[PDB]
Design a protein around this ligand. Sequence first.
Ligand code: FMN
Ligand code: FMN
Ligand code: NNV
Ligand code: NNV
Lengths: 205, 207
Amino acid sequence: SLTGTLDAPFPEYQTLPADPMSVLHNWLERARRVGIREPRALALATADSQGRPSTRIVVISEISDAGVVFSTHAGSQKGRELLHNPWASGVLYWRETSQQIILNGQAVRLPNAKADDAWLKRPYATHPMSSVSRQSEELQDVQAMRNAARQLAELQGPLPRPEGYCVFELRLESLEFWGNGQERLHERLRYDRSDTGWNVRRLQP
Amino acid sequence: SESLTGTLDAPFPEYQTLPADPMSVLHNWLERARRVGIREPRALALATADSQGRPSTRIVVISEISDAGVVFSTHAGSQKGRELLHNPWASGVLYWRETSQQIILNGQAVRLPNAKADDAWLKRPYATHPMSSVSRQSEELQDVQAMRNAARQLAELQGPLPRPEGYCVFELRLESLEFWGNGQERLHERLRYDRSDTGWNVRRLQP
Ligand SMILES: Cc1cc2nc3c(=O)[nH]c(=O)nc-3n(C[C@H](O)[C@H](O)[C@H](O)COP(=O)(O)O)c2cc1C
Ligand SMILES: Cc1cc2nc3c(=O)[nH]c(=O)nc-3n(C[C@H](O)[C@H](O)[C@H](O)COP(=O)(O)O)c2cc1C
Ligand SMILES: O=C(O)[C@@H]1CC=CC2=C1N=C1C=CC[C@@H](C(=O)O)[C@@H]1N2
Ligand SMILES: O=C(O)[C@@H]1CC=CC2=C1N=C1C=CC[C@@H](C(=O)O)[C@@H]1N2
């Protein structure tokens, strides 16, 4: 099913760099240079108190020292799940280069001053709907929501940050970099955090 | 900047009409994705969870849509296979950049009989058989060249091999679905289905 047609170098599969955050930064920078479409669209999995997963796309806003950062609403399914079970996993998949990056760890809600900054960095045209919507609750009246947001759209932004608008940091415990390789020997480079740094392994395809 | 790049029209009448039977909406969206040329529409980001409820994710391909859900193949000894065998609950997401559509598929995965696995294996191009035979998916790879040389020796057959132990087919039998579209004025359109005792409950969700 693969369709990749842009160059996809994976020298790290040979050299086994010690720091997977450096690999992550370099893969993302390469993705930006070669023009991958929506490279930061992360399929993010959380799980409820029974261990049942749920998934959705979120956008990675930043790569931090400990992992990756995204924004969402605290009262959404993902926010409620993360509040009780911080473990999460996300995958980036770039069709053009046949590459995946899998990111596993614990996601921690950051303080309100970080949320305030993230909110002000969103285009102000986003503020009305984000203010009126209680993400993932049932929507009883579509027109009423549309009209309330239109009222707020008439203002000069920015609007106040809504209470539940929050930023999570996914602090990584493991990562995998996947490339298509040659001869169906797909190339899998797996990192796991240790007490003192990171361990690295190749995995069978 | 907002990150959506989609520009293709993506009709979502079902958000207005609330069909009682969500598999018809799945079929409608996948057929349109095929007709308009969405790239790899069946690449599913599939989440499973370990014995402590810690999720893991990877892409798999949806091979078929069944009456109860969607079907994919994998190795039983992989991380996803070992997780599913202990905890059948899974969730997957399809995301189509070109139309700004997402499909979220939640349910329980059931391993299908070996006869089904045999049929799926034989439907794969036989060029895929050597590596799938020698690789113990997700175990540590200690010698890349040894695995390469082994698979090359099997590839000399130039014909189908027996199905390997552990090559398996799962059906994700759905208990809930969501269809997400970009909508108008950032009122993203979220159509959520949950199985009921008889049929399905359908709701719209706030974006
Ligand atoms: C490409 C794309 C990017 C998205 N980015 C985010 C995001 O960063 N944060 C967010 O809360 N929702 C984002 N969404 C909406 C989510 O996919 C989802 O509908 C929402 O967060 C509610 O998920 P939940 O009900 O599982 O918690 C995005 C959707 C798409 C299609
Ligand atoms: C586009 C794409 C499709 C894939 N399809 C499958 C598949 O259908 N079944 C499978 O076992 N692995 C598939 N893989 C490989 C998986 O992403 C993954 O590496 C492998 O299943 C091991 O996952 P696990 O260690 O989490 O169990 C695919 C990879 C890509 C990039
Ligand atoms: O061929 C494809 O479309 C995908 C792409 C890459 C990897 C991949 C694919 N499909 C698989 C189906 C079953 C198990 C596995 C294998 O070959 O052993 C496998 N992996
Ligand atoms: O703007 C983007 O790139 C994405 C695309 C689509 C939906 C979406 C996006 N980013 C969000 C960030 C925080 C919460 C949520 C919101 O606006 O309330 C949100 N939703």
